[PDB]
Design a binder for this molecule. Structure first.
Ligand SMILES: CCCCCCCCCC(=O)CC(=O)O
Lengths: 164, 546
């Protein structure tokens, strides 16, 4: 609560969000983004949560074209609870508020969605999001210039056996 | 990605101007989305952002516009571990054997029977980070293994950093805000302001090693191959600590390239070096910026930017919309000479005709010559010493150039390369009457939209990457959010498009609307002022609360 936003859309569905504070601003962003891209965010969150194999099995890939299981191992390692909590604890009040509002606005759209602009309505992976999910996405992007480029390599790293 | 910032000394109006042309995926977690954010009195910013981020990543405000490009700086280091000769799960630091940490994760997997099974996986970690294996290059044997330290794992400042950028007033303020926080992970920042300042910053999160440590701490063979690899058996090769850095072990802002000028700055994913050739950026750490030959996109940009003539908004727009295949300038004249030299050869006829009739573009109407040129270049890239003029450090803008047709060996190999390229094109379905736009498309529902542009590696400023899918080349990434900003009296004038449209959902009214416009290269106003927003006959409004 304390969440309120004014949204104007111009041509091509570009949102203009007005609010009195970061919480309200995030509220408008998450809502507008969900209207256009709820399924996309839901999918990427499943990826960043390391739950691709859970919903989709081991034969599929992420949108980064990694196999589901190696991708899940990588994100489960990257986004461990202790890492997410330290990341959160290091966030300024303004950023925390932006993220809280975003999650609430996205969830608001989900509660009201009837399929008008949402093709994945009724899928078990389309669900309410948490600020932690936004941290998972952020961390995933953070490492795209580093260890994320070595996701398969990390999963492949196993000590030698008795070989000649 | 491309970026050009123009300043007061070169702009047609004496003010700042910014072209933002990021090249990013057309789907997934890095799919740009347009939005305008306002908290009246203290925040008013518009641009585009990545999925899930409540900040503007590339955008503009009342007096400022900024964009980003992927930099050439290292944002991690590999560490070669010297393993304990008695135990391959232990590694030596200063001659002392340390155990690897084992962190297990558990994953649920939906099976063929639809039931979940639990899979447990062990991740081995050293003091530097997790171990990584590239079979045949970075192995884990009984002698060595490789660990990876990612500098951005400790960068908790990333969101604060873009939100701070969103609040920046002008170029000087933007620089202060970025240098203070050092929260930018892996991109350059280019910006222009109303007062006519043009800014380039290679200001990101980069592992820091003091100059004296590099010769003994680098793995020579791996660094030679462009990998940031260090000796992990020596404690002295830990990233250096400097009190001035915002994060322990990263490079302080004072040591990262910055260029502030009033003419122009540009970047197309090369190093800081030739941002503006009149003021080369040199003497930085190898982890930061090196004097490497620039790619054809940058070489193209510089060929248009250098000189004395004023730059108009239209000029910058047309550098994108021309779809000029700049790599053809270095190669095609001599290729056509070889063609005329071999008119008797039937294996070259179709290729040579197509190449001769080609407008040297990646436009919708560009002929099959582009396809022949692409397949030729892929083979040309593999030839040894085939450039007439090899890259010259003294002439970094005008070399390499031409084919060494002088040499009988080169002439033979180049002819063979063209013969092989021609065979590949003709083995494919494509008839010679087909045009580039008949081939490269973006699918929308059951229909296809023709997409102009071509691969950045061929020097097309409007970089588009596609893959064969069905009967067409399906766009996967490239030109994405386009923003061209000037600063006339009334307020910022922004022009552009989001090439793939706002919504990834086929049901949306905004699934393909801008993609149709991108196909026709018809950029649009990005309305920012209340006057502009209110003038829009499509204006809709919703207020929400809970
Ligand atoms: C949480 C990490 C955020 C990183 C955002 C990346 C900046 C967005 C701009 C670009 O990416 C430019 C490009 O596509 O080269």
């Amino acid at each position: 609560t304390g969440l309120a936003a004014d949204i104007r859309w111009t041509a091509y569905g570009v949102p203009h969000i007005r609010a009195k504070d970061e919480r309200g601003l995030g509220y408008g962003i998450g809502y507008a983004y969900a209207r256009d891209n709820a399924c996309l965010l839901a999918e990427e969150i499943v990826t960043a949560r390391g739950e691709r194999a859970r919903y989709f099995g081991s034969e599929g890939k992420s949108s980064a074209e990694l196999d589901n299981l190696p991708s899940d191992i990588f994100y489960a390692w990257l986004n461990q609870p202790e890492a997410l909590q330290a990341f959160w604890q290091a966030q300024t009040p303004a950023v925390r508020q932006l993220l809280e509002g975003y999650a609430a606005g996205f969830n608001r759209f989900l509660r009201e969605a009837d399929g008008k602009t949402t093709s994945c309505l009724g899928q078990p992976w389309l669900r309410a999001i948490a600020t932690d999910d936004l941290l998972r996405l952020t961390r995933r992007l953070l490492v795209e210039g580093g260890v994320g480029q070595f996701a398969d390599a990390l999963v492949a790293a196993a000590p030698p056996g008795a070989e000649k | 990605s491309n970026a050009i910032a123009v300043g007061s000394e070169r702009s047609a109006d004496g003010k700042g101007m910014l072209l933002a042309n990021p090249h990013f995926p057309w789907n997934g977690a890095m799919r740009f989305y347009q939005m305008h954010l306002t908290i009246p009195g203290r925040l008013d910013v518009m641009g585009a952002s990545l999925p899930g981020l409540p900040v503007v990543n590339i955008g503009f405000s009342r007096h400022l516009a900024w964009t980003h490009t992927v930099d050439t700086s290292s944002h991690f280091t590999l560490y070669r571990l010297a393993l304990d000769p008695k135990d391959p799960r232990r590694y030596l630091v200063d001659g002392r054997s340390l155990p690897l940490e084992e962190k297990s994760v558990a994953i649920e997997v939906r099976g063929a029977d639809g039931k979940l099974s639990r899979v447990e996986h062990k991740v081995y970690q050293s003091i530097y980070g997790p171990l990584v294996v590239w079979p045949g290059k970075l192995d884990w044997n009984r002698s060595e293994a490789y660990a990876l330290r990612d500098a951005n794992l400790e960068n908790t400042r990333v969101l604060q950093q873009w939100y701070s950028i969103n609040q920046a007033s002008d170029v000087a303020d933007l620089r202060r805000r970025v240098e203070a926080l050092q929260g930018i992970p892996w991109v350059n920042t280019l910006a222009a302001d109303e007062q006519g300042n043009a800014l380039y910053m290679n200001q990101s999160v980069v592992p820091y090693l003091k100059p004296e440590l590099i010769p003994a701490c680098a793995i020579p063979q791996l660094v030679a191959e462009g990998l940031p690899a260090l000796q992990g058996q020596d404690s002295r090769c830990a990233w250096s600590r400097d009190p001035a850095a915002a994060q322990a072990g990263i490079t302080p802002a004072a040591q990262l390239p910055v260029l502030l000028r009033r003419d122009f700055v540009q970047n197309s994913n090369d190093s800081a070096w030739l941002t503006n050739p009149a003021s080369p950026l040199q003497g930085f750490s190898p982890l930061v910026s090196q004097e490497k030959p620039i790619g054809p996109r940058a070489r193209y940009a510089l060929s248009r930017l250098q000189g004395k003539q004023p730059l108009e908004a239209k000029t910058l727009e047309e550098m994108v919309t021309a779809n000029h295949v700049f790599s053809a300038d270095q190669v095609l004249p001599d290729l056509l000479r070889l063609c005329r030299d071999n008119q008797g050869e039937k294996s070259l006829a179709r290729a040579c005709a197509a190449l001769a009739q080609w407008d040297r573009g990646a436009n919708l109407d560009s002929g099959s010559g582009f396809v022949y040129f692409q397949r030729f270049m892929q083979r040309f890239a593999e030839l040894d010493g085939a450039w007439k003029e090899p890259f010259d450090a003294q002439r970094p803008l005008d070399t390499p150039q031409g084919i060494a047709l002088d040499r009988p060996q080169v002439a033979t190999q180049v002819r063979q390369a063209l013969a092989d390229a021609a065979a590949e094109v003709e083995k494919s379905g494509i008839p010679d009457g087909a045009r580039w736009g008949d081939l490269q498309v973006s699918t929308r529902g059951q229909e296809r939209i023709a997409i102009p542009g071509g691969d950045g590696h061929f020097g097309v400023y409007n970089a588009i990457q596609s893959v064969r899918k069905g009967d067409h080349l399906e766009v996967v990434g490239g030109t994405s959010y386009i923003q061209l900003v000037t600063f006339p009296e009334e307020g910022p004038k922004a022009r552009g498009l989001l090439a793939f449209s706002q919504s990834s959902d086929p049901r949306s009214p905004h699934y393909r609307d801008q993609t149709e416009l991108f196909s026709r290269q018809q950029w649009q106003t990005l309305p920012f002022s209340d006057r502009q927003i209110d003038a829009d006959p499509q204006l809709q409004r919703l207020s929400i609360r809970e």
